[PDB]
Amino acid sequence: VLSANDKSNVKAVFAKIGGQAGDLGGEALERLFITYPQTKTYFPHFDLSHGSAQIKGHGKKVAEALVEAANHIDDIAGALSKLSDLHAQKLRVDPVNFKLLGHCFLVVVAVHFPSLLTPEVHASLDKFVLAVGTVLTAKYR
Amino acid sequence: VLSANDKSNVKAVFAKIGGQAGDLGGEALERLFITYPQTKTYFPHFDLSHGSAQIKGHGKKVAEALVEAANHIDDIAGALSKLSDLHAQKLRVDPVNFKLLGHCFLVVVAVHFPSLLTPEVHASLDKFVLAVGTVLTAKYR
Amino acid sequence: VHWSAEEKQLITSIWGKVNVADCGAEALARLLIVYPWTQRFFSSFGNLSSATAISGNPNVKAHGKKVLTSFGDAVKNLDNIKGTFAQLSELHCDKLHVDPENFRLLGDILVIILAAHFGKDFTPECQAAWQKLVRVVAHALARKYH
Amino acid sequence: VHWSAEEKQLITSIWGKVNVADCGAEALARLLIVYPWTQRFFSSFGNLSSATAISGNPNVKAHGKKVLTSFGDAVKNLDNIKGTFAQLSELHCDKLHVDPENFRLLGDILVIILAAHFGKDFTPECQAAWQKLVRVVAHALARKYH
Ligand code: HEM
Ligand code: HEM
Ligand code: HEM
Ligand code: HEM
Numbered sequence: 001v002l003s004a005n006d007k008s009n010v011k012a013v014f015a016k017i018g019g020q021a022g023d024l025g026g027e028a029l030e031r032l033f034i035t036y037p038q039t040k041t042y043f044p045h046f047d048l049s050h051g052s053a054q055i056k057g058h059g060k061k062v063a064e065a066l067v068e069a070a071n072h073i074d075d076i077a078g079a080l081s082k083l084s085d086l087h088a089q090k091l092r093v094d095p096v097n098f099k100l101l102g103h104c105f106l107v108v109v110a111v112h113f114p115s116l117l118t119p120e121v122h123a124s125l126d127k128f129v130l131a132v133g134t135v136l137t138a139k140y141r
Numbered sequence: 142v143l144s145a146n147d148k149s150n151v152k153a154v155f156a157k158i159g160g161q162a163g164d165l166g167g168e169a170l171e172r173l174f175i176t177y178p179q180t181k182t183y184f185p186h187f188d189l190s191h192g193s194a195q196i197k198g199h200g201k202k203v204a205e206a207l208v209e210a211a212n213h214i215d216d217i218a219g220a221l222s223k224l225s226d227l228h229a230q231k232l233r234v235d236p237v238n239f240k241l242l243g244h245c246f247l248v249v250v251a252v253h254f255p256s257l258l259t260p261e262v263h264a265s266l267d268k269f270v271l272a273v274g275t276v277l278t279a280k281y282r
Numbered sequence: 283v284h285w286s287a288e289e290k291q292l293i294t295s296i297w298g299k300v301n302v303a304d305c306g307a308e309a310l311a312r313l314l315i316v317y318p319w320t321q322r323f324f325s326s327f328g329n330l331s332s333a334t335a336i337s338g339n340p341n342v343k344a345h346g347k348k349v350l351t352s353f354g355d356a357v358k359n360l361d362n363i364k365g366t367f368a369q370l371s372e373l374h375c376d377k378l379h380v381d382p383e384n385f386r387l388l389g390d391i392l393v394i395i396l397a398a399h400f401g402k403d404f405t406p407e408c409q410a411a412w413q414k415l416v417r418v419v420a421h422a423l424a425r426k427y428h
Numbered sequence: 429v430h431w432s433a434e435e436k437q438l439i440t441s442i443w444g445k446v447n448v449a450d451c452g453a454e455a456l457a458r459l460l461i462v463y464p465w466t467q468r469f470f471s472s473f474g475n476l477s478s479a480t481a482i483s484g485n486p487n488v489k490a491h492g493k494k495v496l497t498s499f500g501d502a503v504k505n506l507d508n509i510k511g512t513f514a515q516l517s518e519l520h521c522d523k524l525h526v527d528p529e530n531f532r533l534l535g536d537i538l539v540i541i542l543a544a545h546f547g548k549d550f551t552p553e554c555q556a557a558w559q560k561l562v563r564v565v566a567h568a569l570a571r572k573y574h
Contacts, residue, residue, distance in 0.1 A: 034553060119457055138142055235468075247394055253401075260333055
């Protein structure tokens with residue numbers, strides 16, 4: 001579970017990464033389709049070619065719910081009410097596909113924002129994204 | 142998450158398996174050490190030889206917290222307050238070692254109580270033991 | 283990759299007593315219900331929006347018989363699970379993209395389902411012997427990366 | 429088990445720029461903190477009850493250098509990861525009993541730690557190439573069952 005310092009290190013970081021989203025949330029999905037092609041099965045409607053307006057733009061959407069999900073660090077289930085259904089009942093996204101995205105999100109922050117993500121911050125950030133998906137799988141687990 | 146019918150099928154079953162605990166909770170640990178020797182590393186203080194007073198008796202303890210954990214189906218974190226620390230901070234039990242036990246628990250009920258554990262009941266039971274451990278790992282996740 | 287003597291005799295002294303039909307739908311109907319992000323690969327299977335239907339579809343019915351019919355190919359040929367499910371190692375990878383965990387998950391459904399069909403005659407050792415057989419038929423498929 | 433041309437050139441055009449010492453404790457200090465049920469195997473390592481200490485122990489310090497020194501044995505010999513970590517496949521199984529998941533977990537710590545040490549010069553393709561290298565050094569050890 002997140003305690004204050006979890007919830008607060010996960011704030012600290014999101015107070016810096018406020019700058020960029022279609023620049024940072026967007027780089028973790030290009031990292032997802034490249035390292036894990038397989039997850040391209042969820043997007044036949046999409047173009048996945050290096051650079052497109054879909055991974056830029058749906059990219060910019062994924063940061064938001066993680067940014068939003070950070071603003072409501074105590075009640076995230078409700079703060080991601082629609083999303084958890086659209087992912088768990090409708091699209092039916094295999095559980096593991098979250099850890100990879102979650103982990104994909106860590107890389108991009110390790111890319112651009114090194115000297116924030118210290119080991120402890122790493123932990124918090126992990127527990128967070130790692131419970132962001134939990135609340136997205138809610139419907140099946 | 143558990144909805145009513147989850148919480149109620151998980152009652153139904155525990156209203157039958159009330160009969161046996163040092164007879165049923167005890168058979169899922171003999172199943173654990175035999176299928177997964179490795180988990181014998183947590184018990185150097187124990188005798189694990191087919192039949193002993195330790196796996197009978199610590200066995201009888203594990204059912205209880207699962208029986209207790211069933212009686213408080215809404216607030217299980219508190220209902221297993223001590224345990225989650227003694228397992229997560231002290232002994233430091235590898236997360237996966239729960240699913241195996243959890244799964245070990247399913248077998249024994251599939252052993253003795255077939256025509257309860259229907260597919261749906263299986264699901265509920267799964268979600269339950271599968272969230273009993275979650276609340277036991279709480280401290281690390 | 284090694285098979286101790288009593289193991290072989292045990293996975294068969296309990297294999298040939300399996301009703302490949304009845305425990306066929308059972309392993310599959312259970313896997314669609316208790317792990318429903320898996321129904322995503324069976325959209326071409328018809329109406330699967332209820333246990334009653336997941337238990338009861340004809341397509342699911344006779345895909346099960348096939349899936350468990352694939353474990354009899356593990357049992358008879360206990361030294362060469364490589365070669366047997368090598369073509370299914372591909373189809374469960376390059377064609378569909380089914381995450382290793384899922385296999386290991388059907389694996390347990392299966393070790394649960396006979397533990398219900400055989401009662402006391404399915405003993406801890408016997409379970410030690412099958413949940414092991416799972417982890418290898420499970421792995422034979424897990425190869426097209428490695 | 430196959431290594432496409434640009435992959436080899438890439439896991440090394442970035443390997444030799446690794447400070448085996450500094451990114452050594454880093455992968456390990458991170459793995460003890462963010463996965464602390466793992467500290468259980470390092471009780472013979474001294475006081476590990478704080479990040480400050482998990483970062484700062486001498487024993488952890490010079491076990492790291494060793495652990496990452498084990499990945500240079502993957503890089504140079506990219507066709508034979510079988511043979512290299514075959515003795516470590518045992519010691520990470522029959523001796524200690526470390527669940528496969530844990531490896532895969534150190535694996536990610538490691539793919540995170542250079543993504544911090546190399547910034548923009550560690551690109552998605554490059555990541556595609558290492559997180560892959562993880563999954564194989566990760567698997568070489570995962571064998572004493574299979
Ligand atoms: C960090 C965890 C995740 C977050 C925060 C997230 C966020 C979002 C958001 C904000 C949407 C847009 C909803 C809309 O406007 O309709 C969405 C949809 C979607 N997500 Fe995720 N998601 C996550 C995990 C995943 C994973 C793991 C996958 C699978 C690999 C996935 C695949 C999809 C797909 C296919 C859509 C629908 C796209 C479309 O039809 O336009 N998501 N997600
Ligand atoms: C269904 C999940 C579990 C339940 C309900 C459970 C229940 C319990 C209970 C009731 C105790 C006794 C506390 C006491 O009297 O001091 C205990 C202790 C213990 N448990 Fe578990 N446990 C679970 C999972 C696990 C797992 C997965 C492992 C590792 C394989 C494990 C290993 C231990 C050990 C080593 C002790 C201390 C024994 C002793 O020192 O006497 N438990 N657990
Ligand atoms: C791990 C044990 C498994 C075994 C032994 C197994 C075996 C088989 C067999 C015998 C077939 C028939 C192919 C043919 O006759 O052409 C098949 C195909 C298939 N399998 Fe599996 N399978 C396993 C696990 C899984 C899992 C975990 C999934 C998904 C989560 C899955 C999904 C499928 C699908 C969708 C097909 C194609 C059937 C169709 O055309 O609709 N299988 N497999
Ligand atoms: C997956 C990547 C890993 C690699 C490449 C690796 C490599 C190594 C190396 C080089 C040694 C030194 C043995 C010697 O010189 O005698 C070692 C031993 C050891 N490893 Fe790992 N290892 C990995 C993962 C892990 C994991 C996941 C754990 C536990 C969760 C672990 C725990 C240990 C322990 C406790 C030792 C013995 C050190 C001692 O004596 O205290 N390793 N491994």
